[PDB]
Amino acid sequence: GFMEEFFEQVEEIRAMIDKISDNVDAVKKKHSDILSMKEELEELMTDIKRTANKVRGKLKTIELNIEQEESADLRIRKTQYSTISRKFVEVMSDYNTTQIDYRDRCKAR
């Protein structure tokens, strides 16, 4: 039952990753309105830091199980580990922008 499980675990990292993406989207609007609540923002930003790290771990578990177990049910995992993993760096890149260099930057072309 290593493979039936490995999906339920992946679909967890998956729906976690949406919670965190759905989240950046509120720390996007909410943050803007401010620039033009103070608590609502610091809360959102903390889930995203934490819930990320949860995900960053459920990933090492996977990275590591694959690695040690190095088939066809394998070749699936290694793939999913990459997909999942990318959609993470995507949500986490997206966010890393939203904050640092202000929403709506006017700076030239």
Sign of CA dihedral 20, 23, 25, 31: negative
Where does residue 67 rank: exposed (0-12), middle (13-18), buried (19+ CB within 10 A)?
Answer: exposed
Instruction: Please state how this structure was obtained.
Output: X-ray
Closest of 84, 97, 102 to residue 48, by C-alpha: 97
Measured from the Cβ of residue 65, the count of other Cβ atoms closer than 10 Å reads: 15
Half-sphere exposure at residue 13, Cβ-oriented, CA atoms within 13 angstroms: 26
Measured from the Cβ of residue 84, the count of other Cβ atoms closer than 10 Å reads: 20
**Which pair of structure tokens corresponds to residue 67?**
């690695």
Options 3.40.50.2300, 3.40.190.10, 1.20.58.70, 3.70.10.10; CATH of 1-109:
1.20.58.70
